Design a protein around this ligand. Structure first.
Ligand SMILES: OC[C@H]1O[C@@](CO)(OC[C@H]2O[C@@](CO)(OC[C@H]3O[C@@](CO)(OC[C@H]4O[C@@](CO)(OC[C@H]5O[C@@](CO[C@]6(CO)O[C@H](CO)[C@@H](O)[C@@H]6O)(OC[C@H]6O[C@](O)(CO)[C@@H](O)[C@@H]6O)[C@@H](O)[C@@H]5O)[C@@H](O)[C@@H]4O)[C@@H](O)[C@@H]3O)[C@@H](O)[C@@H]2O)[C@@H](O)[C@@H]1O
Ligand SMILES: OC[C@H]1O[C@@](CO)(OC[C@H]2O[C@@](CO)(OC[C@H]3O[C@@](CO)(OC[C@H]4O[C@](O)(CO)[C@@H](O)[C@@H]4O)[C@@H](O)[C@@H]3O)[C@@H](O)[C@@H]2O)[C@@H](O)[C@@H]1O
Ligand SMILES: [Mg+2]
Ligand SMILES: [Mg+2]
Lengths: 551, 924, 99, 50
């Protein structure tokens, strides 16, 4: 009786055939594709949607109702565990983890002699899984460590987020990076595959986050670990970075231009492509909402006035540590860091170095009618005439998203040296001076601003001398703030440093005068610095997931 | 004459079905069958959703139609329903089991017209109808929109002149200090380019029209002792109220039967061919028309399509969308054929071999024209999508029946083997970069851009061995026993086959000799039935862990295509990128049939010489081992969904049908048919992930287990805050202010949070009733059918944008007229919350405010006709000549609680129009 | 190593309408048939096909355009024509001998 | 009413042609032979490898 067996599945591959050696490489590609096709407009792996909680930027759109859950996150009031965005990002990151685990499981059943590059592919898969786990840990303190590729799906119901403590979870996340660094090649011919230097830098980042211990039920910093700082210093050595040929770009804007993709500073980036045979290209759909109103729609991720005032400098070229936010930045009377024009597009200035598009304070540039300001982010945007911009119901480009930058490596080395407090503070000062000098020379596209809009550029490196720990920490914090504007790392840095509450409250108080959106804003001491575990996940895993403190 | 005589069987009078003049015969019987819910949006096609005995399963609930012994599940809108002689609905598992293995959701038996022996007849029917829009949603005009915006601005304390929408307000304060608006003015052009002048546009009137429906049928039948034949040709056309939407259908049916070898051999066939061409309305056209403000003109200054400019909300022009969608016409060919042969070796033995075929072809050509509506544009995107779909089902049935009439004992023994095979396929091509931008030029060979190819195929098979035994004693005691062995290709070999028994008992009390004196009681019968049926309506590839090479060629919204294509080299594209595979679902080899047990008790009575007839039914349905597709736990990632037998559904229902027909002394014949039905549904078991995600109810907050299917959990709105003292007295909550919605504190913790939610929505009506009245008097026949539903709650999405300002995804959208009657110090006698621009109180949350009483009672169809007297017809040689005028959906009565309109369709779907029809019937 | 699939669909639709009026007379030895007719013909043809490449399993079950991972092509064309005819036929028979 | 099935396997390997056919013809005479209505229909399904 073959009547019920004649017909077979069409156009698919069964589960028992996906483990064959001729498909594993394809599966490897899958583990990368999720980082370019598995992100939504409201859930992007850059985590810019959840970075509105910081003081760097507001939330764009027509108004507060446009993304009401994100508005509640920004104001830190009226946040419910039954939020669709939190569950969405949780599910997407665990889908990335699942793809990485499937690739690892397929790779583990191969002979070394038959597949010489087995170790490299395994290291790449572990690096991707660790990156996803690190992003989850940044978003949620308590996450499930899915590091067992040879695990049956049913056992996934027995997984819990409290199996390992905070330190143990950090160590488990860092183990993948350690293996990748021990196994990844020094140089990769394909820019998509991460190199040894990228793994070492991301391991240093993980150890730096591990150093700021968050032990106890609450979310308060309970000390600084010296061993973690030593590990960071070990894994951020300039010799390792120079082995892979990575260094600071000659110009800052080169890090955010299609013409200079996969540069020296681009230690690791998500390769976005156009005209690649898909429906519209593997464009950065996570930045679709960030395009200005001049393109027709969207207009999200609008930088705040606080960041613009932070970019303001004094006559000595140093940032104003106490009087930067007292008055709004003036283009004609106040010295400004050149990095501002590569990050924030102020009104009356060319948009993405295009003379044919000048930002104006009208409805053609702001979708909120001035409610959220008129500033437009420029790092994630591209020139309208680049030919790299395509309309796929959302204006998205093929510009690569650089996950790890060499400036980040230098600043993390400076942070480790400063927090060690065992000498070598001058080395951190030298790294900060190098970053400032790189910023000073980044005027290849904005040199005419002196003779066109009266823009005064004045930035100078710090003098090489003895500096106290608090002064060096403040200078490093200011350098990080002025270096990674609109790069979706301010809130995580504030949470790690343990000063998120005071900074957020001060920002709310300062910006309530010029923005009514922060009229009812309020930040809780131990509740709003970590996204709560989704209620759907807790309900699905009864007696296994514990909600974060304060919820 | 019921074809089961011992189960829950509903016989539908086909004469009243054709009176309504509906393309779909199923839609005509919307409320004429107890325990049967028919939901129709009102689109030109007769497409509708059918639910029998409530919801009894978590998978597809579509009932199994049977026409001329051929089973199917496709809609009857694509078939000609005017050539139907009898309609029978089998809502009992025991009665419907013998008709197929897909009787979990009920079986509907449809019999086509056949030539009556000894006569030859013809019938020609013509019908012309006009459909008019009745549920015209009231929206703010330019002045009303400006007044509402000014009211919101003054309520929020902001300057109304900073709206930056061209509105200048002259306003002041009264004695009490409440703001009052004196006048408003508008700029002539909404933009600085003077290309979009301001105007008062009725978008609902602009996108709606008066549709025309035409129906022409011609049927002929001829019977004889050696055989019979029947041939029918039908044409239908319906223009929808929404512009650029239409549906027409040609139908040709040929039935015949031949008797050879002195009635031993019989060969019959029933065939029909259908051709339906349809242009459908774009998704959310009503929503788009309601959202766009009336200030936007239909046409710009240069004659191009109007669109929002400046700060106006990003809403596409509904008229332009309809104009561009008018070329999205799809053609559907339906092939429904059947050939059967019957042999009688002797008097009591019959052998029937039947072959049925259903072939469906669909061809569509979708066009994407470049549009530029103000700030709304697609960057000059022009594309063509040519899609082809094929469905092929073939069934073979072998039946052996024996009948005996020994003594007072009648015995029927029947056995049968059935084989079903369905194969579906589809493929489509996509082309871009066109220049002329016309349907004639838009062909894939004429394109000059990126081309894409899509294609898929699937199928399944069914094997059934069934046996039915019927015993009748003294025409008083009836016993029925049936057994089914059913197997499908969707399961593994171990769990391929399953067994289903069913038993039915019946006792005719009127045949007992102890009540011979009860002359009034003409007939009384008590019947019971306990049956089991199998359900396997799931995905074909359910037991396989599916890995698919999703390169990323499929269009996706928001960029979540989940494609597998990465530029590992980092060359920004320029060629074929490396690809791979992704997991779609995890297979499960332990999946088996879903077992539904139905217990039915029925009482059939007929009194006063077969004048007052009726039936009362009570049914209990229990579905277990339900094949449900559970989602991933959350850390399983993509492909975590899998099919499992972890469901439990319970349905307890009552039905009552009554009918009284009688004449009158002066010559009036009145027939009244009343019907009432009620049911209660409950979910007993469900997977933990399914209950957590709340796909079947609960909104992801509480488990739906132990509650009705589709029930929704939300907050409770205890009025609105009329003063600051009320705000202070009430428990603290986010966004609390004067004129905002007050939420009840269920747990009395002093703070309103996510735990202050309870079950608020129950989509189960208290009872659904229907009443048909037929009056005959002096060649005048009047038909009047009323359908009512009582005790049903509805969630109104229209209220979300009619009772609030800026409560949608974007602000400055057009709202309802009743929004003008919002709460204010000047107008304290109102329940609508005060207007605001910021949703601080978060009124978009699910609550009792959006739950309204859906009870209604509407005149589904009224018809007044005149029949030509027999002598005039014979003078004109006509056998019958009749004319009639009818109204469909003419009048309705709603509840005062329902603030909206059209309780049957309280959402943004297709509206239900009023039909005025004139028709004629000729019997040459 | 070239693997590809080509899914092609073709439709032809012809419809004809004919109206014929015939009269016959048998007067004396003369038989006369007079027939007139109007005929309308309409033919419409169309075709479209999709092309996909880069398959792995290389079996008819797996070879579907959605399962491909290579360059895809779309082809499509349509055409048609119509015919109108007015014809008349007269037949005369004398003594069943002269036609 | 006619039902036909044909199948031909060519001499060249992997070449074949089969065909199912269903024909229904009918005619009816009404109104004492004044009116006549007739129809002739056929459906064919041919599967071929050339
Ligand atoms: O809330 C409803 C359900 O959505 C859920 C599902 O679990 O989650 C939200 C879900 O929705 C997604 C879609 O990808 O994001 C929506 C989310 O994104 C926000 C910002 O957070 O807005 C982003 C921008 O999107 C814009 C376009 O610029 O509009 C989106 C808006 O429009 C829709 C459909 O809306 C309607 C419905 O018929 O159609 C018209 C046009 O919008 C309106 O009248 C109706 O509201 O799609 C856009 C349509 O445009 C078309 O071209 C017309 O045919 C088609 O391509 C689309 O159909 C919806 O996508 C959406 O409502 C712009 O307005 C915004 O600036 C935010 O506003 C919105 O909430 C996804 O990311 C997320 O997962 C559940 O919360 C809930 O059950
Ligand atoms: O995507 C959901 C939304 O779009 C529709 C089409 O408007 O569904 C899209 C796909 O549905 C398909 C798959 O069968 O058919 C539905 C439409 O085609 C029609 C043509 O008669 O129905 C085809 C056939 O399949 C049913 O719909 C299901 O059994 C039967 O009712 C019918 O016999 C037509 O009735 C439907 O509109 C496919 O054609 C589309 O790609 C809508 O279904 C839905 O609202
Ligand atoms: Mg790129
Ligand atoms: Mg409470």
């Amino acid at each position: 009786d073959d009547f019920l067996d004649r017909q077979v599945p069409q156009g698919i591959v069964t589960g028992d055939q996906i483990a064959s050696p001729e498909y594993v490489d394809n599966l490897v590609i899958s583990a990368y594709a999720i980082w370019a096709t598995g992100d939504d407009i409201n859930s992007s792996f850059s985590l810019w949607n959840y970075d509105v909680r910081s003081d760097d930027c507001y939330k764009g759109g027509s108004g507060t109702e446009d993304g009401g859950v994100f508005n509640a996150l920004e104001i830190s009031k009226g946040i419910n565990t039954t939020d669709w965005n939190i569950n969405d990002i949780w599910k997407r990151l665990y889908q990335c983890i699942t793809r990485a685990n499937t690739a690892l499981q397929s790779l583990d059943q191969m002979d070394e002699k038959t597949y010489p590059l087995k170790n490299q592919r395994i290291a790449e898969m572990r690096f991707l899984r660790g990156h996803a786990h690190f992003m989850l840990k940044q978003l949620f303190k308590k996450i499930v460590i899915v590091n067992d590729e040879n695990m049956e799906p049913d056992a996934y119901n027995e997984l819990s987020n409290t199996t390992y403590t905070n330190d143990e979870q950090w160590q488990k996340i860092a183990d993948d990076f350690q293996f990748a660094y021990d196994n990844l090649p020094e140089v990769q011919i394909e820019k998509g595959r991460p190199a040894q230097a990228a793994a070492a830098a991301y391991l240093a980042k993980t150890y730096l986050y591990k150093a700021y211990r968050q032990d106890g039920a609450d979310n308060a910093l309970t000390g600084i670990n010296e061993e973690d700082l030593k590990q960071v210093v070990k894994y951020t050595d300039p010799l390792i970075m120079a082995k892979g040929g990575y260094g600071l770009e000659t110009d800052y804007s080169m890090n955010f231009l299609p013409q200079y993709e996969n540069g020296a500073e681009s230690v690791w980036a998500i390769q976005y492509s156009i005209n690649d045979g898909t429906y519209n290209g593997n464009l950065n759909w996570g930045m679709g909402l960030t395009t200005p109103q001049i393109l027709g729609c969207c207009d999200f991720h609008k930088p705040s006035q606080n960041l613009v005032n932070a970019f303001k400098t004094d006559s000595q070229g140093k940032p104003l540590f106490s009087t930067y936010d007292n008055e709004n930045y003036e283009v004609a009377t106040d010295n400004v860091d050149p990095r501002l024009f590569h990050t924030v597009g102020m009104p009356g200035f060319p948009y993405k170095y295009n003379e044919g598009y000048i930002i104006q304070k009208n409805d053609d540039w702001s979708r909120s009618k001035g409610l959220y300001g008129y500033y437009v982010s420029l790092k994630e945007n591209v020139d309208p005439d680049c030919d790299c911009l395509k309309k796929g119901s959302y204006w998205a480009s093929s510009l690569n998203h650089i996950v790890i930058r060499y400036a980040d490596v230098l600043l993390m080395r400076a942070e480790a040296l400063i927090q060690l407090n065992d000498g070598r503070i001058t080395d951190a000062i030298s790294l900060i001076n190098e970053v400032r000098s790189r910023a000073a020379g980044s005027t290849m596209l904005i040199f005419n601003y002196k003779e066109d809009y009266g823009v005064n550029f004045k930035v100078t490196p710090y003098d090489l001398k003895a500096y106290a720990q608090d002064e060096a920490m403040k200078m490093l914090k200011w350098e990080r703030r002025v270096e990674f504007g609109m790069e979706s790392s301010r809130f995580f840095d504030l949470v790690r440093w343990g000063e998120a509450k005071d900074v957020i409250n001060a920002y709310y108080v300062t910006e309530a005068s010029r923005c009514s959106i922060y009229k009812n804003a309020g930040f809780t001491e131990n509740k709003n610095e970590y996204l709560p575990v989704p209620f759907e996940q807790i309900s699905a895993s009864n007696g296994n997931y514990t909600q974060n403190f304060g919820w | 004459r019921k074809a089961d005589l011992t189960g829950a069987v509903s016989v539908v009078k086909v004469d009243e079905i054709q009176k309504q003049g509906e393309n779909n015969p199923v839609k005509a019987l919307q409320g004429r069958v107890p325990g049967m819910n028919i939901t129709a949006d009102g689109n030109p096609s007769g497409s509708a959703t059918v639910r029998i005995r409530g919801i009894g399963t978590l998978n597809n609930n579509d009932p199994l139609y049977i026409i001329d012994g051929v089973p199917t599940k496709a809609g009857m809108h694509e078939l000609n329903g005017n050539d139907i002689e009898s309609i029978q609905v089998l809502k009992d598992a025991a009665s419907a089991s013998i008709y197929g293995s897909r009787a979990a959701n009920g079986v509907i038996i449809i019999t086509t017209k056949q030539g009556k022996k000894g006569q030859i007849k013809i019938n020609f029917d013509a019908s012309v109808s006009a459909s008019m829009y009745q549920s015209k949603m009231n929206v703010l005009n330019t002045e009303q929109y400006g007044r509402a915006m000014w009211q919101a601005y003054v309520n929020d304390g902001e300057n109304p002149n900073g709206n930056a929408l061209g509105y200048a307000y002259n306003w002041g304060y009264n004695a009490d200090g409440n703001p009052v608006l004196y006048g408003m003015t508008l700029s002539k052009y909404l933009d600085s380019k003077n290309t979009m002048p301001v105007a008062d546009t009725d978008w609902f009137d602009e996108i709606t029209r008066t549709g025309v429906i035409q129906q022409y049928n011609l049927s002929v039948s001829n019977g004889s002792e050696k055989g019979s034949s029947f041939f029918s040709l039908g044409y239908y056309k319906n223009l929808g109220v929404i512009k650029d939407t239409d549906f027409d259908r040609f139908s040709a049916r040929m039935n015949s039967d031949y008797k050879l070898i002195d009635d031993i051999l019989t060969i019959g066939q029933h065939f029909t061919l259908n051709r339906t061409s349809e242009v459908q309305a774009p998704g959310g056209i009503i929503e788009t028309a309601l959202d766009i403000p009336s200030a936007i003109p239909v046409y710009a200054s240069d004659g191009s399509w109007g669109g929002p400019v400046g700060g106006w909300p990003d809403r596409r022009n509904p008229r332009a969308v309809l104009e561009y969608n008018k070329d999205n016409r799809y053609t559907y060919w339906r092939m429904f054929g059947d050939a059967y042969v019957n042999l009688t070796p002797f008097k009591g033995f019959n052998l029937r071999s039947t072959f049925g075929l259903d072939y469906a072809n669909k061809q569509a050509r979708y066009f994407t024209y470049p549009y530029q509506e103000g700030t709304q544009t697609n960057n000059g995107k022009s594309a063509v999508e040519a899609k082809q779909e094929h469905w092929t089902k073939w069934m073979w049935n072998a039946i052996a029946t024996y009948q005996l009439e020994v003594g007072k004992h009648r015995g029927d023994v029947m056995i049968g083997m059935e084989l079903n095979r369905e194969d579906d396929s589809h493929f489509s091509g996509y082309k871009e970069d066109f220049s002329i931008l016309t349907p004639d030029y838009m062909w894939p060979d004429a394109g000059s851009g990126t081309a894409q190819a899509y294609g898929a195929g699937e199928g399944y098979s069914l094997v059934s061995f069934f046996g039915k035994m019927n015993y009748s004693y003294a025409d008083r005691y009836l016993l029925s026993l049936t057994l089914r062995r059913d197997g499908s290709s969707r399961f593994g070999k171990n769990h391929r086959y399953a067994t289903f028994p069913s038993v039915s008992l019946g006792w005719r009390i009127t045949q007992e000799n102890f009540m011979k004196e009860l002359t009034w009681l003409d007939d009384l019968k008590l019947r019971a039935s306990w049956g089991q049926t199998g359900n396997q309506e799931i995905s074909n590839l359910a037991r396989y862990t599916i890995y698919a090479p999703n390169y990323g060629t499929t269009d996706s919204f928001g960029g979540q295509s989940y494609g597998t294509a990465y530029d590992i080299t980092g060359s920004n594209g320029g060629g074929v990128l490396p690809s791979g595979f992704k997991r779609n679902q995890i297979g499960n080899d332990n999946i088996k049939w879903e077992t539904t047990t139905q217990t039915n008790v029925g009482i059939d009575f007929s009194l006063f010489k077969q004048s007052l007839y009726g039936s009362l039914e009570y049914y209990y349905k229990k579905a277990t081992d339900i094949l449900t597709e559970m989602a991933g736990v959350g850390v399983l990632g993509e492909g975590g969904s899998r099919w499992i037998n972890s469901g439990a559904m319970k349905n307890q229902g009552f039905e009552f049908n009554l009918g009284y027909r009688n004449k009158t002394a002066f010559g009036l014949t009145y027939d009244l048919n009343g019907n009432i039905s009620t049911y209660r549904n409950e979910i007993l078991e469900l997977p933990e992930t399914v209950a957590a995600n709340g796909k079947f109810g609960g909104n992801g907050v509480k488990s739906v287990v132990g509650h009705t299917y589709g029930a929704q959990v939300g907050y409770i709105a205890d009025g609105i805050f009329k003063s600051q003292d009320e705000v202070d007295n009430h428990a603290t909550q986010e966004g609390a202010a004067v004129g905002r919605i007050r939420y009840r504190d269920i747990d009395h913790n002093g703070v309103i949070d996510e735990r202050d939610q309870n079950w608020i929505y129950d989509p189960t009506p208290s009872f659904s009733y229907g009443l048909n009245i037929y009056l005959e008097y002096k060649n005048f026949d009047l038909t009047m059918f009323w359908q009512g539903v009582q005790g049903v709650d509805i969630i109104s999405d229209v209220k979300k944008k009619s009772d609030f300002w800026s409560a949608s995804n974007v602000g400055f959208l057009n709202k309802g007229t009743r929004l003008l009657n919002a709460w204010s110090p000047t107008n304290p006698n109102s329940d609508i919350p005060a207007l605001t621009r910021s949703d601080t109180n978060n009124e978009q949350r699910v609550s009792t405010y959006f739950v309204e009483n859906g009870s209604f009672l509407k005149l589904r169809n009224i018809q007044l006709g005149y029949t030509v007297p027999a002598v005039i017809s014979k003078k004109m040689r006509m056998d019958r000549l009749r004319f009639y005028c009818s109204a469909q959906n003419l009048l309705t009565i709603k509840s005062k609680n329902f603030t909206g309109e059209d309780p049957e369709n309280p959402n943004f779907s297709y509206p239900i129009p009023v039909n005025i029809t004139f028709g004629l019937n000729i019997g040459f």
